[PDB]
Amino acid sequence: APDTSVSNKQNFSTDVIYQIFTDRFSDGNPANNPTGAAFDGTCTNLRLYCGGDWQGIINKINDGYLTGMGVTAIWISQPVENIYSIINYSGVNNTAYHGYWARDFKKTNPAYGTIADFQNLIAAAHAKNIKVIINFAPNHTSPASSDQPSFAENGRLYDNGTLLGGYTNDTQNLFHHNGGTDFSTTENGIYKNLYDLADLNHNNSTVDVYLKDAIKMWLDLGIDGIRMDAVKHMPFGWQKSFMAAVNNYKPVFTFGEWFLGVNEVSPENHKFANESGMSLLDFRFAQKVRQVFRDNTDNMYGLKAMLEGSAADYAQVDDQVTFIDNHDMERFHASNANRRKLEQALAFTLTSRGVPAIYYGTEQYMSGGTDPDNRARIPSFSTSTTAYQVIQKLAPLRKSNPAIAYGSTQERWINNDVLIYERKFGSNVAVVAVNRNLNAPASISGLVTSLPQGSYNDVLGGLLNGNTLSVGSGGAASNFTLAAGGTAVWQYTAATATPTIGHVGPMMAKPGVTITIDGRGFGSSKGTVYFGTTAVSGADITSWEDTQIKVKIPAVAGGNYNIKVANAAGTASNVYDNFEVLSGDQVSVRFVVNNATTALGQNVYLTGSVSELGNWDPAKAIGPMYNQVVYQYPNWYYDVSVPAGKTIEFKFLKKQGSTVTWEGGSNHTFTAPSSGTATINVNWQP
Numbered sequence: 007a008p009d010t011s012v013s014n015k016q017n018f019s020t021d022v023i024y025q026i027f028t029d030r031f032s033d034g035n036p037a038n039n040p041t042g043a044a045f046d047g048t049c050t051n052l053r054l055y056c057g058g059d060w061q062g063i064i065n066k067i068n069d070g071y072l073t074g075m076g077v078t079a080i081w082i083s084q085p086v087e088n089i090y091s092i093i094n095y096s097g098v099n100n101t102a103y104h105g106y107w108a109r110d111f112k113k114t115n116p117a118y119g120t121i122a123d124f125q126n127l128i129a130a131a132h133a134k135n136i137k138v139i140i141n142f143a144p145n146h147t148s149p150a151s152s153d154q155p156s157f158a159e160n161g162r163l164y165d166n167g168t169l170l171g172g173y174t175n176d177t178q179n180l181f182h183h184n185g186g187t188d189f190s191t192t193e194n195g196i197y198k199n200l201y202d203l204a205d206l207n208h209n210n211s212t213v214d215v216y217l218k219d220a221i222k223m224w225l226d227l228g229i230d231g232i233r234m235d236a237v238k239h240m241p242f243g244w245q246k247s248f249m250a251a252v253n254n255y256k257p258v259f260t261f262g263e264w265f266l267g268v269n270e271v272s273p274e275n276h277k278f279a280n281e282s283g284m285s286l287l288d289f290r291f292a293q294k295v296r297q298v299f300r301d302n303t304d305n306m307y308g309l310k311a312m313l314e315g316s317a318a319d320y321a322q323v324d325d326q327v328t329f330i331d332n333h334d335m336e337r338f339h340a341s342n343a344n345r346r347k348l349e350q351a352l353a354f355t356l357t358s359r360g361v362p363a364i365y366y367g368t369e370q371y372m373s374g375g376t377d378p379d380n381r382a383r384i385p386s387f388s389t390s391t392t393a394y395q396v397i398q399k400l401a402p403l404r405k406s407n408p409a410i411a412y413g414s415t416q417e418r419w420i421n422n423d424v425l426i427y428e429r430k431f432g433s434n435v436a437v438v439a440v441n442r443n444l445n446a447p448a449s450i451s452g453l454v455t456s457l458p459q460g461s462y463n464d465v466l467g468g469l470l471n472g473n474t475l476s477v478g479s480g481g482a483a484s485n486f487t488l489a490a491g492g493t494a495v496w497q498y499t500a501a502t503a504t505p506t507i508g509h510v511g512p513m514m515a516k517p518g519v520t521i522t523i524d525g526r527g528f529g530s531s532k533g534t535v536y537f538g539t540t541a542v543s544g545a546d547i548t549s550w551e552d553t554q555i556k557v558k559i560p561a562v563a564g565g566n567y568n569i570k571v572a573n574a575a576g577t578a579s580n581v582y583d584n585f586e587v588l589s590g591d592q593v594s595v596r597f598v599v600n601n602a603t604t605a606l607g608q609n610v611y612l613t614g615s616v617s618e619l620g621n622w623d624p625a626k627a628i629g630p631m632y633n634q635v636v637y638q639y640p641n642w643y644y645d646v647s648v649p650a651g652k653t654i655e656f657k658f659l660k661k662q663g664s665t666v667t668w669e670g671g672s673n674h675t676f677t678a679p680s681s682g683t684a685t686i687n688v689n690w691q692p
């Protein structure tokens with residue numbers, strides 16, 4: 007099957023996602039509507055259930071609203087059963103309409119539908135070439151008070167109906183009891199509660215095994231991707247072991263939500279996306295887009311800086327999920343704002359690198375402040391809005407032109423208000439011109455592109471005042487006027503003679519697992535696949551065609567490898583780096599080191615005899631470790647994904663910058679569990 011097929015669960019770069027807040031999209035089955043005080047059929051009280059469900063999504067899939075827009079993927083509110091409590095927060099009733107208050111990860115939220123409804127949704131979507139992503143929030147259960155068990159459902163967690171435990175009398179330690187986070191430090195935000203939500207303890211074997219079993223159930227139901235909620239708030243090492251569980255079973259595109267504020271560029275965020283096994287919602291992209299197109303707090307130079315910086319900071323920038331707003335931000339379109347601002351932000355996002363995700367209702371020009379005002383019921387299903395047509399014209403390009411899906415990004419013209427950028431992949435090219443200045447045209451002369459000589463029509467057909475482009479020899483464009491608020495898209499596609507890799511997924515798994523290599527120019531005859539210097543050919547290459555290769559990871563030592571392919575004739579492709587071969591199945595183990603004193607700025611790290619611990623290379627040591635919440639300095643701790651059942655030797659390090667101080671004595675040793683978790687507690691050896 008081609009890289010663009012709906013069956014490709016490992017690659018969403020050729021897709022356009024539609025963010026569906028289930029309860030607020032379409033009530034297709036009034037019969038499963040919550041009743042009484044938990045419901046408001048008029049959807050005036052945005053904190054109660056309005057009725058939106060999966061039958062409704064099925065209907066909008068079948069009547070062409072989404073397909074007519076060029077939408078090829080959707081993500082939905084967490085599907086698992088939530089508490090049924092109607093909580094009164096300072097005079098106002100609140101319900102789990104948002105799906106974030108889980109009580110049973112192995113059952114569905116009856117308000118959204120039954121398991122059968124979910125199966126029907128998966129089927130209906132796939133029949134229309136639409137992939138389905140589910141929100142999954144393993145960080146917590148629901149609102150709770152240990153001193154007041156009668157409050158809500160006490161954060162109780164059930165396993166397919168069987169009560170496991172609640173926040174009160176939590177002798178099993180299924181949850182954390184360290185108060186609420188103030189977001190002062192990453193560690194603080196991980197081992198303390200978000201709001202009053204019962205924080206799950208992933209170091210508890212029951213919890214660990216339970217959540218991994220739960221996600222497998224959903225994987226078996228046919229989901230095509232996972233949107234991990236609040237990933238900045240769970241142990242990064244545990245999440246890696248989680249992604250390993252997913253990838254070593256049935257790999258599907260996964261990304262997490264890690265909020266970044268305006269002007270916030272986070273190295274931790276980059277590292278998580280680069281090493282966790284999942285990508286992230288591109289807040290850095292979203293926030294800059296809002297600054298430039300919405301709030302006028304930066305110009306095109308800032309937009310360019312964001313594009314160049316992110317392409318360098320993210321190992322797989324093409325896996326980051328882009329957007330201009332979502333369920334937590336104020337809607338991009340302000341009540342009194344010119345609609346062209348939203349339309350340009352949309353065109354920009356749809357033609358930029360990554361995986362575009364449009365928040366439901368954006369195309370209907372919905373406005374609204376922060377939660378819950380940004381979650382109003384979609385006002386209409388009109389295909390006649392300009393925004394709807396913008397998506398309709400550009401969304402399909404991610405499928406037809408690989409430059410948009412996998413291409414590099416290069417600025418070709420720029421000033422305060424204008425940015426003309428080029429996407430390029432193999433012989434494919436796309437040039438996008440945007441003039442955010444709604445009052446002043448711009449004279450574009452000296453524009454040089456990779457477009458072959460000829461005349462190119464604006465793919466938007468002048469919808470956003472774009473124009474035709476005339477390209478001479480050398481790719482030099484003839485002088486033209488870019489209209490005020492003008493947005494144009496010119497593109498070119500052609501066969502690629504040389505094997506070219508545009509995407510690989512998953513990027514982390516153990517030997518034997520099948521990975522998907524997408525691109526162009528692979529040829530129809532099986533060639534060769536390389537993991538580092540190791541060559542794979544023949545039977546282990548399950549299938550091979552021009553745009554997609556399915557190949558089993560060879561049994562090489564755990565580590566980071568460069569992926570490359572060669573066609574049947576032996577012509578080698580470009581290198582797709584940063585592929586992590588795991589040493590085997592993974593388990594999350596907590597390492598605790600006692601009496602490791604340090605100077606301010608100096609931190610303790612973990613190193614060991616397996617790639618998962620960096621194979622003794624300090625530059626790849628695990629950490630910086632923590633020393634405040636669960637354990638206190640001079641004791642440090644960290645949760646780490648390590649190969650199950652392996653006997654591992656390790657040591658701790660104290661690092662100040664790249665300067666390293668090693669534990670003295672012999673290596674520490676332990677054997678990781680075959681499943682579940684474990685805690686290894688040792689003393690720092692001088």
Ligand SMILES: OC[C@H]1O[C@H](O[C@H]2[C@H](O)[C@@H](O)[C@@H](O[C@H]3[C@H](O)[C@@H](O)[C@@H](O[C@H]4[C@H](O)[C@@H](O)[C@@H](O[C@H]5[C@H](O)[C@@H](O)[C@@H](O[C@H]6[C@H](O)[C@@H](O)[C@@H](O[C@H]7[C@H](O)[C@@H](O)[C@H](O)O[C@@H]7CO)O[C@@H]6CO)O[C@@H]5CO)O[C@@H]4CO)O[C@@H]3CO)O[C@@H]2CO)[C@H](O)[C@@H](O)[C@@H]1O
Binds near residue numbers: 104149333334377
């Ligand atoms: O020994 C003493 C005492 O200890 C224990 O009590 C402590 C608690 O255990 C501990 O958690 C802590 O709780 C306090 C909080 O730290 C503090 O912040 C405060 O919480 C308030 C909050 O300030 C209020 O704003 C209000 O919260 C609202 C939100 O503002 C709304 O936006 C809404 O939210 C929900 C969203 O609508 C949902 O979409 C979803 O959000 C998700 C996002 O959409 C998603 O993008 C993101 O990634 O993840 C989010 C989560 O999935 O969920 C949101 C949360 O439900 O609604 C909430 C609810 O109104 O109210 C909270 C609660 O009052 O106050 C807390 C109480 O003090 O500190 C406690 C005391 O130290 C023991 O439990 C106790 O018995 C002991 O006596």
Ligand SMILES: OC[C@H]1O[C@H](O[C@H]2[C@H](O)[C@@H](O)[C@@H](O[C@H]3[C@H](O)[C@@H](O)[C@@H](O[C@H]4[C@H](O)[C@@H](O)[C@H](O)O[C@@H]4CO)O[C@@H]3CO)O[C@@H]2CO)[C@H](O)[C@@H](O)[C@@H]1O
Binds near residue numbers: 609633639
């Ligand atoms: O955002 C939170 C901060 O995180 C990081 O801080 C870590 C330090 O870099 C790391 O050295 C360690 O800090 C411990 C000190 O090493 C240790 O000496 C002692 O600190 C003493 C200090 O020496 C003394 O002068 C002062 O009077 O009392 C301190 C004790 O409170 O304990 C420190 C831990 O409590 O761990 C830190 C994380 O907990 C970032 O480096 C920092 O920039 C961030 O602000």
Ligand SMILES: OC[C@H]1O[C@H](O[C@H]2[C@H](O)[C@@H](O)[C@@H](O[C@H]3[C@H](O)[C@@H](O)[C@@H](O[C@H]4[C@H](O)[C@@H](O)[C@H](O)O[C@@H]4CO)O[C@@H]3CO)O[C@@H]2CO)[C@H](O)[C@@H](O)[C@@H]1O
Binds near residue numbers: 657668670671673
């Ligand atoms: O692959 C090559 C070798 O790999 C493994 O060796 C690793 C060790 O097992 C591991 O402990 C670590 O070694 C560090 C020491 O633990 C640490 O004490 C220090 O050693 C210093 C020593 O303190 C000092 O007295 C002496 O003068 O210099 C030593 C350094 O030369 O740093 C060590 C790291 O350099 O990392 C080793 C891999 O680098 C296998 O165990 C080994 O058999 C392989 O040959």
Ligand SMILES: OC[C@H]1O[C@H](O[C@H]2[C@H](O)[C@@H](O)[C@@H](O)O[C@@H]2CO)[C@H](O)[C@@H](O)[C@@H]1O
Binds near residue numbers: 417419420451454
């Ligand atoms: O002609 C090559 C040149 O094109 C672009 O330069 C623009 C510049 O961005 C505009 O602001 C204005 O100064 O016109 C120039 C072309 O004459 C590229 O930005 C530049 O890198 C490239 O060399």
Ligand SMILES: OC[C@H]1O[C@H](O)[C@H](O)[C@@H](O)[C@@H]1O
Binds near residue numbers: 267
């Ligand atoms: O600062 C709070 C928020 O205000 C507005 O919604 C901006 O568009 C957004 O970028 C910012 O994060």
Ligand SMILES: [Ca+2]
Binds near residue numbers: 034037038057
């Ligand atoms: Ca309903």
Ligand SMILES: [Ca+2]
Binds near residue numbers: 240
């Ligand atoms: Ca947590």
Ligand SMILES: [Ca+2]
Binds near residue numbers: 320321322582
């Ligand atoms: Ca890369």
